[PDB]
Structures are given as C-alpha cells and as structure tokens.
Amino acid sequence: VLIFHGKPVHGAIFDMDGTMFDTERLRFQTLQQASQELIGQEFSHEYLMQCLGLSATTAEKLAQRLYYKEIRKRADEMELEHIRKHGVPIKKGLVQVLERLRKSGLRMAVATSSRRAIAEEYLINANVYKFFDVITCGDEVEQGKPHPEIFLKAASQLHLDANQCLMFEDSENGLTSAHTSKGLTILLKDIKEPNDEMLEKAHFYYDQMYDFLTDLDQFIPVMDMPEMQEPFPQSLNQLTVGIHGFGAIGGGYIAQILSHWDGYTKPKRIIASTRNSLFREAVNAFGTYSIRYGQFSYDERIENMSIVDSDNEQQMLEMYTHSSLIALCLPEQAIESESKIIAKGLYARFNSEPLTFLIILAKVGAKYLVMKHLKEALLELTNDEDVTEHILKEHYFCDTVVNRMVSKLSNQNLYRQLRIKHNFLEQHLEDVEIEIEDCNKLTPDQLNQASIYVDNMRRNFQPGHILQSMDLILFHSETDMPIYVEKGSPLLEKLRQVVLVDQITDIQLIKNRLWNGVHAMLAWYASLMGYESIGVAMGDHLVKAFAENLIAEVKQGLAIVLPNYAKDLDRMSQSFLDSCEYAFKDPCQRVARDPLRKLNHNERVMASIAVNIRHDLPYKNLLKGAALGYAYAIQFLEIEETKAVEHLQQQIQNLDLSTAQRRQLEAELVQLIQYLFS
Amino acid sequence: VLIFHGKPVHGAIFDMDGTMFDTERLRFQTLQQASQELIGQEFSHEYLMQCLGLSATTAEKLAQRLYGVDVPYKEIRKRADEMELEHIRKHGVPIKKGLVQVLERLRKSGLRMAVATSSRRAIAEEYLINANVYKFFDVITCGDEVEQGKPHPEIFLKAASQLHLDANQCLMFEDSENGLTSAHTSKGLTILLKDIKEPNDEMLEKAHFYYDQMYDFLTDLDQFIPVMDMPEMQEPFPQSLNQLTVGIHGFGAIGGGYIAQILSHWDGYTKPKRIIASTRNSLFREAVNAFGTYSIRYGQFSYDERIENMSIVDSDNEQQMLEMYTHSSLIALCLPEQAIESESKIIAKGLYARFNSQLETCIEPLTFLIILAKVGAKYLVMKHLKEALLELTNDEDVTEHILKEHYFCDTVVNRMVSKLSNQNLYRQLRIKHNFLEQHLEDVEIEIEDCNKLTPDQLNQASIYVDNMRRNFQPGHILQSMDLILFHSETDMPIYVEKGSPLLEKLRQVVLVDQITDIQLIKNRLWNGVHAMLAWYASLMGYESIGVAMGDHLVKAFAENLIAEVKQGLAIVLPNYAKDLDRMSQSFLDSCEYAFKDPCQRVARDPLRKLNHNERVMASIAVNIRHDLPYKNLLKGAALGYAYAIQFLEIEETKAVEHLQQQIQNLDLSTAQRRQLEAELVQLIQY
Ligand SMILES: NC(=O)C1=CN([C@@H]2O[C@H](COP(=O)(O)OP(=O)(O)OC[C@H]3O[C@@H](n4cnc5c(N)ncnc54)[C@H](OP(=O)(O)O)[C@@H]3O)[C@@H](O)[C@H]2O)C=CC1
Ligand SMILES: NC(=O)C1=CN([C@@H]2O[C@H](COP(=O)(O)OP(=O)(O)OC[C@H]3O[C@@H](n4cnc5c(N)ncnc54)[C@H](OP(=O)(O)O)[C@@H]3O)[C@@H](O)[C@H]2O)C=CC1
Ligand SMILES: [Cl-]
Ligand SMILES: [Cl-]
Ligand SMILES: [K+]
Ligand SMILES: [Mg+2]
Ligand SMILES: [Mg+2]
DSSP, X not given: OEEETTEEESEEEEOTBTTTBOOHHHHHHHHHHHHHTTXXXXXXXXXXXXXXXXXXXXXXXXXXXXXXXXXXXXXXHHHHHHHHHHOOOBOTTHHHHHXXXXXXXXXXXXXXXXXXXXXXXXXXXHTOGGGOSXXXXXXXXXXXXXXXXXHHHHHHHTTSOGGGEEEEEOSHHHHHHHHHTTSEEEEEOSSSOOOHHHHHHOSEEESSHHHHHHHHTTTSOOOOOOOTTOOOOSSBOSOEEEEESOSHHIIIIIHHHHHHTXXXXXXXXXXXXXXXXXXXXXXXXXXXXXXXXXXXXXXXXXXXXXXXXXXXXXXXXXXXHXXXXXXXXXXXXXXXXXXXXXXXXXXXXXXOOOOEEEEOOSSTTHHHHHHHHHHHHHHHHHXXXXXXXXXXXXXXXXXXXXXXXXXXXXXXXXXXXXXXXXHHHHHHHHHOOOOOOSOSSSOHHHHHHHHHHHXXXXXXXXXXXXXXXXXXXXXXXXXXXXXXXXXXXXXXXXXXXXXXXXXXXXXXXXXXXXXXXXXXXXXXXXXXXXXXBHHHHTTSHHHHHHHHHHHHHHHHHHHHHOTTTGGGHHHHHHHHHHHXXXXXXXXXXXXXXXXXXXXXXXXXXXXXXXXXXXXXXXXXXXXXXXXXXXXXXXXXXXXXXXXXXXXXXXXXHHSSSOHHHHHHHHHHHXXXXXXXXX | OEEETTXXXXXXEEOSBTTTBOHHHHHHHHHHHHHHHHTSSOOOHHHHHHHTTSOHHHHHHHHHHHHOTTOOHHHHHHHHXXXXXHHHHHHOOXXXXXHHHHHHHHXXXXXXXXXXXXXXXXXXXXXXXXXXXXXGOSEEEEGGGOSSOTTSTHHHHHHHHHTTOOGGGEEEEEOSHHHHHHHHHHTOEEEEEOOSSOOOHHHHHHOSEEESSHHXXXXXXXXXXXXXXXXXXXXXOOSSBOSOEEEEESOSHHXXXXXXXXXXXXXXXXXXXXXXXXXXXXXXXXXXXXXXXXXXXXXXXXXXXXXXXXXXXXXXXXXXXXXXXXXXXXXXXXXXXXXXXXXXXXXXXXXXXXXXXXXXXXXXOOEEEEOOSSTTHHHHHHHHHHHHXXXXXXXXXXXXXXXXXXXXXXXXXXXXXXXOOHHHHHHHHHHHHHHHHHHHHHOOOOOOOOSSSOHHHHHHHHXXXXXXXXXXXXXXXXXXXXXXXXXXXXXXXXXXXXXXXXXXXOXXXXXXXXXXXXXXXXIIIIIIHHHHHHHHHHHTTOSBHHHHTTSHHHHHHHHHHHXXXXXXXXXXXXXXXXXXXXXXXXXXXXXXXXXXXXXXHHSSSHHHHTSTTSTTHHHHHHHHHTTOOXXXXXXXXXXXXXXXXXXXXXXXXXXXXXXXXXXXXXXXXXXXXXXXXXXXXXXXXX
C-alpha cells in the first residue's frame, strides 16, 4: 500500500500509445502515408485526433460515420518496421516510474486499445513487460474505449478495485474510460492540449512523464548506503552522466556511485574522458572494465561505459550537453588547462534541467579554484559578463570529501594483462571450430528463419562468451563507500552512495592536514627506505611509529584551530591508519606525487608546522617529514638541490610567522635535509 | 579469526609450483617431448622421478651417466621451458584441483595471503594472472628478492613480515622437501601436500599436517569454515569458479528455473565451471549455446536472474549424455513420472559408463537429486534403473554395486515454475536479432604513443585490442540484453535427504534425516489446499486459480484453509514451525497470478485425494483430535465429492460408500466418526 497525496494506492494501470511510448505521432504519419498510396487522399487531421486511444475495430466504425482494414494493415507494417530500425520511442521517465511503483509493492497492468500482437511487440522491445502482472488489449474486450470495460477488466485481473488503482492516459477517449471505471486518473499531454472537460475528469495532470516522476519520488522511500558486493540496478533510465578524468577516482570510485545511482535505475551511458589511449581503446574493446577490491578479492564490473578522448572537442561537448551529472576528477595542475574544455561544454549546454557538477579535488577550497579558472575561461570565449554569471549560478557546483584510497594500473601491467588474456582469446577461437530440427509447435518458415537468427547470433556472441570469466582490471580500490558532498543539488538527495553535509570546508581542512598530509610524509619515508607499497611499508615498526607520531602533532594543532572537531580527530586518524594498514596494491609513488606542491606554505605539511610553532606545540616529526619530502624530490624525481632550497626559502617566507621563527625553521629544516643526504 | 586445529590463523603463505599449480607434471611431459625431438629417445619416467628435489647440475650429471656425456641436457631443458610457457599461455596454467575452493574459504575468513615462490617475479606474476588467483594474494615474495632461498626460512619469514604477522600466525603450504624446511624453520603452521613423489619419513615428521592432495585439505578446512545462510532473492552467485561439473537431466521448468539457481549458488565460496542440461528441444538448446547463457524471470520483483556457464545437450545424443554422467560430480533428475521408464535406459548407460571410465571425476561417487512431485519418487527411479542396468550389463553384482555406490536423494520442492513456449521464444529471438543488426550499424584502432611502453610492445598492443574489439564488440549488447526462458516464483529452500558429503556445504539446500516429515507438510499444507481451492474455483465457474483469486470468497477461503491446516501441523510437527509459516505465504503468493495453472489438473483424481491418510481427511482428524477449527477443511472435503459428481460424473452412491469407508479408518471415537459423516453429506446438498 502506497500513499500518493493522501489517497491509498494498491495498483497502477498504464496506457501504452502516447503515455508509455510516443507511437501515436508515428501512427498519425503511417495512416496518412498508407491512405496516400491506396485511396489517394490522406485521412482528415480531425478523424485521426478523434481516433486517439480508440480500438482498431472502433476506428473503422468512425470511418463509416465520416465516409480501413487494408489501410491500417500497411500503416501497422510501416510502424513496426520503423520500430525495428529506430526502436520503441520510450517516454522519458517511464522506466524510472515503473520500477519505483513495482518496489513500492503495487500490482501493475497495461490497458491499451491496441491488439495483443502489437501491444506485446512494443512491451517486449522496450523491456517494460516484466513490470506488469497482467495486460488488457483491444481484442478480448467486448466494448472498447471510451467505455470503462477495458480499465475495469485490467483492475479485476489484478484482484483490486479500480478506486485503489492509479490510471495513466494521454487521449480524451481513454481518460473518460479511466474516469468512468472510478480509478485515480492521471493525464499526460502527448498530441492534444487538455480541454476543460479533460482537466476536470483527471485527479492529477502533468505536462510530461518526468513531471509525474518528480511528484511521485517525494512519496517513494530514498534508499540508503549500498554494501560492498551489492549489485547495481538492472533497469536503465534515459539519463547520461560524465566523468571528466577517467583516472583512479573517476574510474575506480565515482563509476560505482553513478552505477548505483538511486537504486531504481542506472544511467544508460557513462562518458569518461582520458588522453591514455590504451585505457580508452581497452575499455571500448571489452565494452566494460572491473574495479578490484583486494581485501575481499572482489572484481566489480562497471558496464554501459563510453570512454572518449579529452582533446576531441565534439565528444567532450557531447558529455556536457547530454549529462545530468558530471564529476571533475582532476588534480590541481590540470584545472587551469581543462577549465577551457569545461567552458566550451557549459556554453554549448546553454546553446542546446540544471547540471550537477561534483568537484573531487584534494585541496582546501577546491570549488573556488575551479570556479576562478571557469569564470576566466568562459569570459575569454563568450565575451559577455551576463551570460557567464547565469551559467555559473544555473548549475550546482558541489565540493566533495573522498576518504577512499584508489590506485590506477600502469600501462605495462595493462599490456601484461592484454597479452595474457589475448592468448586465451586466440585459443578460444580455435575451440569454437546450425539447423533448428523438429516441428516444435512452429511452421517450416519460422524454423528456417529461427536457424538464420541463431546462426549469426552464435557467430557474433560465441567469441565474447569468454567475457563471463574474463574481466579488464584497471583499478585497485579499498572498500570505502560514502562520498561527502555539499547540500544544494536536489539530484544528490536521492543518490544512495552520497552523504550530504553542511560545513565541508572544516572537513576538507582536516582531510588535507590529518589524512592527506600524514599519507604523503610516511610515503616519502617508506619510499626512501625502499618500500614500493604503502600496505607493506606499514608492516615496518619505524614507518608506523612515524605515522602515529605525525598524527599526534597534527591533531594537537587542529584541536586549537578546530576545537569543535577535536572530539572526532581520534576516530578520523584511526580510520586513516586502518586504510593504510592493508593498502598492499596502493603504490607509495602515487601518494608521494608532486612533493613541492604538497610542501607549499598553505598545504598538508607546512600549514601544520606553522600552527604548532604559533601555539608552542611539538613539530619535531612534522619537520622530519618536510625534509623527507625535499629529500624524495631530489633523490627519486631528480629536481636539483638548488631549486629545492629556492622553494624551501620562498614557501617559509610566505608562512604567517615572525622573522625569528622563519630563520629558526629554515635553519632547522636545511640542517635536517643535509643530515639525511650526508 | 580462523581457528585451524585449535590454532589462531591470521595468514596463509602458499608455494606456487607443485602446491598451487600442477607445473611439475607439465615439466615431466615437456622434458620427455623435448628429448624425443632432439636425441630421439625420450628421458625415462624413472629418471625424472629421481630428479625431483635435485638441482639442475645434479640432474644434468645424472643424464650424462645414463644417456652419455655429450647429451644436450641444457638444450633439452631450454626447449622444455619454451614448450611449458607456450602451453601455459594458450591453454592456461594447470591449477591443482580444489585450490580456488580453498583460497576463497581462507580469504572470506579474513586471512591475509602471500605466495613464497623460488620463481622470479616476472614469470610468477604471469602464472598467478593466467590462473586468475593473483586477486587472492596481498603480497608475493620471489627467489630473486632474497639473499638465501629454500631451504633457508628467509622467503617465508619475509612474506609473513610483509603481511604484518609473525610466522606462527600463518598457515604455510609446500610440496618440496627444502620448501617445507624453509616453512617449518620460519615457525609457521606447515601444511605438506603430496604432488608426484611420496614424501620421505623425515618430511612427514617435520610437517604439522599432511594431505595426499589439495582436496583432502579442502575437506579438513570445511570443518573450520561455516556453511553459508539460505540465499536471499537477487543475491549474487559466487564470482570464483571451481573445477567441478554438475548436470541437469531434464532442462525443463524446474530444472532450468530452480535447480540451475541452487547449483549456481552452490556453497557461496565457488560454483561449478559447467552446468550440463539435457533437452530434446532444438530451439532451446541452440539458443542458450548461441547466447552462452539464459535468464530466469521473477515477476513479483521484475528481476531477471542470469545463469552463466551453461551447456545444453541433446537428450538423444549418447556421447553428450554419457559425458554428463562421466564428468558431473552431482546430477539432478528433473523429469516427470511418465519419462522415468524411457530415460532409465539413458541413466543406466551413464552410470555404467561412469563405472567403466578410468577418469578421476568418476572415482568419487555421484550425488543424484530426484526432482519428482510423487511420494516414494526415488524408489520408482531405482526400480526402473535396476531393470535397465541388468539388461545392459548382464551382471547382477555390477548392477547392485552401482546402485549402492552413488547417493540417490529424495527432494521436496515448493517453487512453481513455467517453461516459455517455442512461439514466444521465436518472438524473443526475432526482436533481439533486430537489436544485434542495429548494434552492427554503429560498430562501423589506434593507441597513439604512451612513451612508457616500447614501440615493439606498443605495436603488438594495437594487434591485441583490435583483435579483442572485432570479436567482443558484437557481444557488448549482452550487457543489458538477456534470454528469458523461465517465469519462476520467489521460493528458495530445497529439502534433500541427508547422506551425501557434497550436500553438506550447499547453502540453498535444507538437509533432513527423513524426507517424510516435510513431504507430509507438502501433501497437507500445499497440495491439499491447492486441491480444495481448485474444487471451490471449479464449482464457482473459474478455469484457472489466477482468475479465481480475484473473487473475495475464493481468496478468503484459501487464507482460512491455510490457517486451519497450519494450526494442526504446528502440534503434530512443532519442529517445522518456521517452515509452515514460510510455505503458507509462498503458496498464497504463487496462487495470486497463477493464470497458467488450470483447475482440472489440480482437481483430478479427487476420491484418491479424499482418502483417510491423504491431504484432506488426515488434516480434519488431527484438528478434531486436538480440538481445532475444521469448518473450512470440512467445506473443502464437501467441494471434492461435489466436483466428483458434477464434472467427473461419479455416482453419488459411489462417493458416500467411499466417504463412509474413509471416516471409519480415521483414529477418532465412534461418536466423532458419525458426527463428521452427518455434517459432511449435509454440505454436499448445496
Ligand atoms: N585517488 C585517491 O585515492 C584520492 C585522490 N583524491 C583526489 O581526487 C583527484 C583525483 O585525481 P586521481 O584521479 O587520483 O589522479 P589520476 O592521475 O589517477 O587521474 C587523474 C585524471 O586527471 C587527468 N590529468 C592528470 N594530470 C593532468 C594534467 N597535467 N593536465 C590534464 N589532465 C590531467 C588524467 O588524465 P590521463 O587519464 O590522460 O592521465 C586522469 O584522467 C585528485 O585531486 C586527487 O588528489 C581524493 C581523495 C582520494
Ligand atoms: N515446475 C513446477 O511447477 C514444479 C515441478 N515439479 C516436478 O518436477 C518434475 C518436472 O517438472 P517440469 O520441469 O515442469 O517438466 P517439463 O515437462 O517442464 O520438462 C521436463 C523435462 O523432462 C523431459 N520430458 C518430459 N516429458 C518427457 C517424456 N514423456 N519422455 C522423455 N522426456 C520427457 C523434457 O524434455 P523437453 O525439454 O524436450 O520437453 C524436460 O527436459 C515433475 O515431476 C514436476 O511434478 C516439482 C515442483 C514444482
Ligand atoms: Cl609483459
Ligand atoms: Cl576446484
Ligand atoms: K567439499
Ligand atoms: Mg492513448
Ligand atoms: Mg614447490
């Protein structure tokens, strides 16, 4: 039992033509073309408008009143031929509605004036026949629309009263049929502006299918955080989504968040951008890729992926125009150069529902950096101050905090994979090296045709049978589900794996200092000791002790800067050590990336050191980590010892300290850097 | 976290060659094949057995003593190494039987796992990727990454420290003498596994636990890891495949729409690599093999359940049907009662071919599940199987041996399933052939330059992706396109006779010592109400149960009738309290939209169903003996005799003669007997 605007609902009976699918517009075209090549004169627009939601038998009776079997047969042949080429034109929101009504526990059916042969054909093609317990067609009914028998029979077969059932319809005739049955009427405009008579009959009215979905969803229970190995939804909506940067986060975390979606439907398409062509071609070659969760040896297949080139404009604009939600999964260095491709996308969207823009970036005030470079990019292209500030305040730009640690596979390891799995494909194509016999309730022509279908289906699918076991592994991800996003976008309210928060800035700072800062400094210490794995490195008593000692010095500083969050630091720090403890497939190199950027004055290392000096706290271990960062940059990255000091001096000069504290810090740090080398 | 023989285990470190993979026997084969090519005479089995444990130099000097000083041993050894990699790369690394089953058990027990191999990183990593077992291991410690290899404990000590564990917290698996010394010295719980050569007395004394093979350790490990809970609806199947094959003798409604799911869930750790199902239907066989898979539809939740790793065979094909009984570890007989006598010949040939076969899959007995609705079903099959074996074998001792060797299991099934029509299947293939044609419109490569890769391997990478794309791209559509062949209900648990060790870990199976208890509940609660409801619907002019449940009188009667029978069974069988409550709702859910469920077949042979010990009269006597309401049951009995007289044209005199005879057989007081008779005949009037 579902409560929809106070009234209790047990079932939901749907109309097919004009309500579920846009087949009424096609029937309008076919009947016109059919008449032109038979009788010569096209049918009156008044006749066709009166024949909407009317049985083929009842449509012929109207033709006698004005002035059909020969006409309608060829018109039906033209229609199903158009459907076999272009597919059934599914109204936007149908699949999203049907699943919500099914999982609410409603007993659903279809009441259409079309034949059982034509009705099923479209219900099968669209893949929505599985949502209905019964269907009532314009064949087994005695008195067709606008008589309520078809809507009474549909309700009776569901073992419910019509007054307990919702009834969807587009036509004027069909609405009367739904109303006289005495069920909760819903009217969806298709090819007739509702009359005063029609609007009075209908209990609820909506301009399109997606308008009803929005109204329904406020009564539908919003599903909660998915579990690790929990499946994604089966049914697909007509919405697209984007991943600007098919990297560790985009491919190995966001892909799961988007694939789960609301738990009712998934995006039909996920467009992801990368310049890594091997990654691009490999995913598109397989059709899917898998995220490996090493802790539980679980491979998570991500399907309905379309990997595109980042430099290729038409494909990037394709994403920014069609996508309902796009995730920006780029590091700081990429923001400026990529802001130009973002600017083109959003301006193309204006030229073409508000976009939900997720900024996934490990920086304090990540949105500001993106929005700064976006404004500069848009203004330089558009050359209009008004159109830019409209775009900037139309779309939902959301800050995020991601706790999950994800790793991108190397091109050598992906080549090693492709090489090994190609040998299996070659051998499979040798092992493979038909006649549908017996008159099994079929005609000889059907059996002959069936044989040809199965022959070329086997020929096409047989090579791809190996994909049942064979997966394309591209990411090593930990089992951390919940992403923390800013409040604003109504779409994010219903996303399962999203947890909305208020003051993100406070969390971003703690994430930067306590999480990202210690992660980088132990990764430098681990790298210099000869560890290539974070997980293995944490098996060393010295490496873990250093991380514990750093955590202690950072929390002591954050406890003064954020006394309101002091209570939660011990939990956050312990959660970090756990994630590091068994990060075996997570390479130190990935975390130790760009030491100088991370050794900036307003970043995860020097910011903590500054706080501790001001408040007379110990920064002994924090000072060592800073030196190990410059030691890593000179040794592993080969950046020069002269440039290291010119960065050290510059960034220490930018710190909010007295000249006394600066002199001491620089002298203490430069001595400790020379000590490690000599 | 995982207790193994009273010892807390947090780690598991495996040797690679001889312990995980059967690479020692592959090296044997190649060395002989390589010797046959070059020197003309292949190296003796006895020489290669003598070489196990010895170094390459000691092995070379031994080859010189036997086959002459100028023997090209290094040339033969290199050729053998080349033949080994070639076979491993195309046909796959030979995995020891039961490894994946063990690795999943240890991993789901939360153990950190490593590989300690004297092999070099490059070849070791390829083998683990090839076998698809690398996912299971956190770290890997190689011979080129230690100063002192086996028998020095460094490689096992390093592996343990990399997992943040002491050696004594780790299970250490090994086949070779030196490796066991390395594992033992380190202080780990050593598990010695025989590969080819019987281990010496010193090795057996050293080892904490010894097993003839992996599967003997798997059987021991099963005692320390749990049987998983009853699968829920929409719960995924296991990801990892084991090396077992299973069979469905009769790819029908229940075979493909229920048993397929049970076998696909298996023990929740792994599932069979192949499910061989038999059918005479060409369209079904050729369609499933073309897709490589089919799907089961659950209307209630609108869920399409995809059954992977299926292989449909012809029921009239001997070589295919014999291969089922030869290769399968467990077979399910999903035939009707009419098909037993005919197929018993094909069963006899199968089990006799298994008896005659010298394969390793036929050494262990067969677990035979009898999926048949009739009481004493197992024994009907056993009768026909005995007759069919005798006439084929012409040997009474061989016939009886086979009948006593295998596990024949009675089963009680509660899931109603309907097989799709060939007309509806043809339509499904026609509609989803247009989508294939539509998909092949779009299909009509370059990986630029990484710079991280070399042009030689970068050019070669283009060949792989292009070849993969050309073959896989047509089958991209299968992502969200299924082949629906079965409409099934949401009932999960299958009741099976306890006995077969292979059933002890199957999670969707409910093991019972005697099937009689749940088969009595199936008779009275399910089939009894089904018959009494069908009679009520028929006399009120309804052809299907599905249509009838729309009537408030029919659904109200069904609900009230379920309550009376359940209340009785709760006193008779209080140990099945949870089973009664579950089976009650399952019946009412299935009845709701049972449009393909005619009353005639459910209402056939009424007088047999109205017997004193049968599904109607027995329930009345129980409810009377325990003072419970039987008003709906009494109405149910009346409708049966009424249905017999009106529809089946049974004489009223014949119905009463039966009615009275059944009442007098019931264990009631002479007073209670007469009362029921007077009440029942009074209702038959109306
Ligand atoms: N990975 C993690 O565990 C977490 C990281 N983060 C943060 O989220 C963001 C995700 O970055 P991540 O995906 O980890 O890094 P990756 O390198 O794994 O992927 C980065 C993406 O950005 C693109 N990119 C990288 N450098 C440039 C550049 N100089 N110019 C243009 N495009 C570029 C890459 O394109 P191509 O594919 O062609 O290289 C790739 O698509 C970062 O800010 C990261 O710090 C957040 C928390 C956890
Ligand atoms: N489905 C249900 O509702 C339930 C079924 N059961 C029991 O399971 C058993 C099978 O049910 P179901 O699967 O519906 O039976 P089906 O008729 O659907 O298919 C049965 C299998 O046996 C074969 N078969 C059928 N008749 C013959 C015959 N006369 N000679 C040779 N082979 C034959 C079929 O071959 P082909 O594939 O070529 O037709 C098919 O493989 C029955 O005893 C039934 O009572 C138990 C609980 C409920
Ligand atoms: Cl390689
Ligand atoms: Cl196995
Ligand atoms: K077992
Ligand atoms: Mg209409
Ligand atoms: Mg060995």
